[PDB]
Design a protein around this ligand. Structure first.
Ligand SMILES: O=C(C[C@H]1NCCC[C@@H]1O)Cn1cnc2cc(Br)c(Cl)cc2c1=O
Ligand SMILES: O=C(C[C@H]1NCCC[C@@H]1O)Cn1cnc2cc(Br)c(Cl)cc2c1=O
Ligand SMILES: [Cl-]
Ligand SMILES: [Cl-]
Ligand SMILES: [Cl-]
Ligand SMILES: [Zn+2]
Ligand SMILES: [Zn+2]
Lengths: 490, 480
């Protein structure tokens, strides 16, 4: 029965709403900007969270929890960014019917609370480094048009905050966290990305520099930051008097800080990239169910003893899949036809469906069907334990390389501004030589109406030969500092 | 440690949670920073329970932190935090920070249950709620706190009842098997039960320093009350009479940690139950004789590293302390304060005789183990520690639960700092009079394991103003 009524290419938003609802991944909510994560998508987040947490604790980071409320003073004292952020802050100002003396803010991030804590907690050189992480929820009252995973007012993330004695420690951590974020996207979500440094405009305002992983959703034609990992350097230490006495040098020494974060926006990217016109398509490594066994060949008058015999062999296959470490469940609901179940689990996006009927068990075998391809492969029951991991391996690769192919089909390089704007009009992203200065990024953005910097990619396409190369914008005559990636932004 | 449990309980509690690196104070009242050392106790409880209820068929989801006014108001009302402005721009309708999630998840349950085919719904959340509720205290009276709230809907009341009991069994197992704290399973009286429910089961535990009892977790049977409120119904297949589902909800909060502090922490700081301690064993290398020798520094640190490595690989959570800028005794006191179940003192004579001394945080008892037997004695040891803690608490609690049918000794026992099983009518009127004329004592639970069977030919409720035949024996005490 249930099915997608729209298509990715013609009506992307209604397609997206149909895939997150009929994929049982989201329920809408009477508070705007906020969405119910039903269990089918929360398991995606749970896999991402668990994987990344295991990584950063193996690294020596530790898990903590600061309160959801922040003082007006914690917030505004020594402002990180008066910026244009203060409007986006959710303010509690009444208990029941009693208004409170000073109002308290729901956290948008925890710098202004965790940095005073670090100032207390570091009274000597011996107390360093501090590597603390929280898995928490934040609220940003963002005046834009909201969407389930991509622009939400409350969302889950993890924020890691770190303080070291040396800048070398801090630099290397920034890159180790970025490698793990990159792994979240490629190895778990089968999504390709570009590692880079934000330009001076797009960097976190308070940081020394800001690294990032950036991805592209081509169906929409827009690019999106997938995760970031900042090097604050000494800015916040000097702000918050996070100091120790140098063991040799008698003089006060400020610590070197990093912060890094990744949000549930990841899941939205996963949809936009991998979900097709029949519904969701889950990367095998985050799917709550990797393999679903639908017992087939049950007619309106299949008998309870026949039904039970088949159900029982299905549970035995499901069990030897669990014991092989792969996440398999069987669907034994009696008020649903085999075909109804095929369509159900297709909408839900399970990498593999197993059709096992009476004719299959009589030949001691089964059929496996890929959610991405529709490709069917008959496996002898014996080879199950060895064939099914290969398959799930294969499925990931196909999902990934397909996605990367699309990304490379939507990355065009030019040194000429006209070819830049042609490429941008044709719905893709452009590596071009950029002076790096903020004014020129502004002129570029205005004059593509718009196109923002994405990152200065780590893998540069070529080294700028200064005898020739000038920044792609004709109004600045600055020689090109590097290749930068520009595109229309989310 | 500067104060003591026996004489000044509150400032002892404050010194135990501060010098234990568990809590950092915060400029919003009611709210406290869970540092990593206490957050790990929560994480152990969280993971143990989540695995259990996941094995049971419950599934994890996450609903928003915000409820807007309409969702909510469909009697606690003073205690609700209201967002009403973004920045300096006032918002049209104000939204409440969730204090519990019934008013949000139950409309969703009505929308998602379009047929009988859709049952049961078994969903759990690990989330933060705020109830702007006195004189606050870090794990016992917090305005923002962590918990898990699970909400479930079935077709029959039998499923729902049996689940209530299974979850209560799991909470008691949290308290006894993980936190080594004894508890009593029971039913709240109609006065103390969850207002919207049919009934409320509970586990209660005893803190002897205070002489007071505290509710450790709950598991409610909402019956058909909330289904009827929010129209969670299905078509009866036979005659299509709208049928209301039977609902339960259950919860457990970070109050556990506070209970575990107050039950088990002594005058030297925390002492963590082995099954929740982030570090079960900490290795302190001894005898570094301050530049008496330097090459040996790495040699000793290295033998400590292979012992820690074989403890990890044996499944024992062991970390070693190889920091050079701290006195050995400083490390002893540090890990005593933080409550690490076992300290290993390992020196040069120890490494030369192929052994180590492990000393229990609860006992102070010292026991020298040959490295050969290490992987085998150390699990036993930690098993041994848990039992001694639990039985210790058990001893204490049962030396302080008194049975009576007479109000005079009820009120004497209540002066002597313990909790009383007495015959009770069950009425709300009479419970109110009991608390008022005991100043004060509330019902705790009607225990499942009853002390003797009520003979209605004689037994009357212990309060002299109600002459009702006693409905049952219940447990009363002074409580948080
Ligand atoms: O949130 C950040 C910076 C970093 N915080 C720690 C986790 C990783 C993260 O990149 C950027 N940022 C973004 N949005 C914000 C919104 C508001 Br409102 C405020 Cl006050 C502040 C901020 C703000 O600082
Ligand atoms: O929160 C509860 C009832 C149950 N909710 C689901 C998880 C288990 C839990 O016992 C009781 N309770 C307690 N304190 C409250 C405080 C406020 Br404020 C509000 Cl609005 C409501 C409540 C409220 O309903
Ligand atoms: Cl977001
Ligand atoms: Cl930013
Ligand atoms: Cl509490
Ligand atoms: Zn330029
Ligand atoms: Zn009575």
């Amino acid at each position: 029965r249930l099915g997608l009524e729209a298509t990715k290419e013609d009506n992307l938003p209604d397609w997206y709403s149909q895939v997150i609802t009929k994929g049982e991944m989201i329920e809408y909510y009477d508070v705007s900007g906020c969405y119910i994560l039903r269990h089918w998508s929360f398991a995606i987040w749970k896999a991402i969270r668990n994987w990344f947490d295991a990584e950063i604790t193996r690294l020596g980071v530790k898990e903590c929890y600061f309160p959801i409320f922040v003082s007006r003073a914690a917030l505004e004292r020594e402002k990180t960014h008066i910026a244009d952020f203060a409007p986006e802050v959710a303010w509690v100002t009444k208990s029941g019917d009693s208004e409170l003396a000073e109002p308290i803010a729901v956290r948008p991030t925890s710098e202004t609370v965790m940095y005073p804590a670090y100032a207390k907690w570091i009274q000597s050189y011996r107390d360093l480094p501090i590597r603390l992480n929280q898995w928490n929820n934040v609220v940003r009252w963002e005046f834009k048009h909201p969407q389930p995973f991509l622009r939400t007012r409350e969302f889950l993330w993890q924020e890691g905050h770190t303080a070291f004695a040396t800048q070398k420690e801090a630099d290397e951590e920034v890159l180790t966290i970025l490698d793990l974020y990159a792994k979240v996207y490629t190895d778990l979500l089968a999504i390709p990305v570009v590692k880079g440094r934000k330009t001076e405009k797009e960097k976190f305002a308070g940081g020394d520099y800001t690294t990032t992983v950036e991805a592209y959703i081509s169906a929409s034609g827009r690019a999106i930051q997938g995760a970031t990992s900042h090097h604050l350097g000494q800015n916040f230490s000097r702000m918050f008097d996070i100091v120790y006495e140098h063991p040799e040098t008698k003089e006060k020494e400020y610590v070197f800080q990093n912060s890094w974060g990744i949000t549930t926006r990841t899941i939205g990217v996963m949809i936009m990239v991998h979900a097709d016109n029949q519904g969701l398509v889950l990367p095998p490594r985050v799917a709550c169910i990797q393999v679903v066994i639908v017992p087939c060949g049950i007619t309106a008058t299949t008998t309870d003893d026949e039904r039970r015999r088949l159900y029982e062999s299905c549970r035995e296959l499901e069990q030897t899949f669990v014991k092989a470490g792969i996440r398999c469940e069987g669907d034994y609901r009696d008020n649903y036809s085999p075909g109804w179940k095929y369509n159900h689990w297709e909408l839900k996006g399970v990498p593999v469906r197993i059709e096992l009927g009476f004719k299959d068990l009589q030949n001691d075998q089964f059929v496996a069907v890929r959610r991405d391809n529709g490709a069917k492969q008959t496996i002898k029951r014996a080879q199950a334990t060895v064939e099914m991991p290969k398959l799930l391996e294969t499925i990931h690769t196909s999902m990934y390389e397909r996605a990367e192919r699309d990304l490379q089909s939507h990355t065009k390089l030019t040194k000429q501004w006209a070819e830049f704007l042609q490429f941008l009009e044709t719905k893709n992203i452009i590596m071009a030589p950029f002076c790096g200065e903020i004014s020129c990024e502004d002129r570029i953005k205005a004059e593509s109406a718009g196109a923002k910097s994405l990152c200065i990619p780590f893998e540069q396409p070529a080294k700028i030969d200064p005898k020739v190369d000038k920044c792609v914008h004709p109004a600045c005559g600055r020689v090109a500092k590097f290749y930068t990636l520009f595109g229309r932004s989310y």
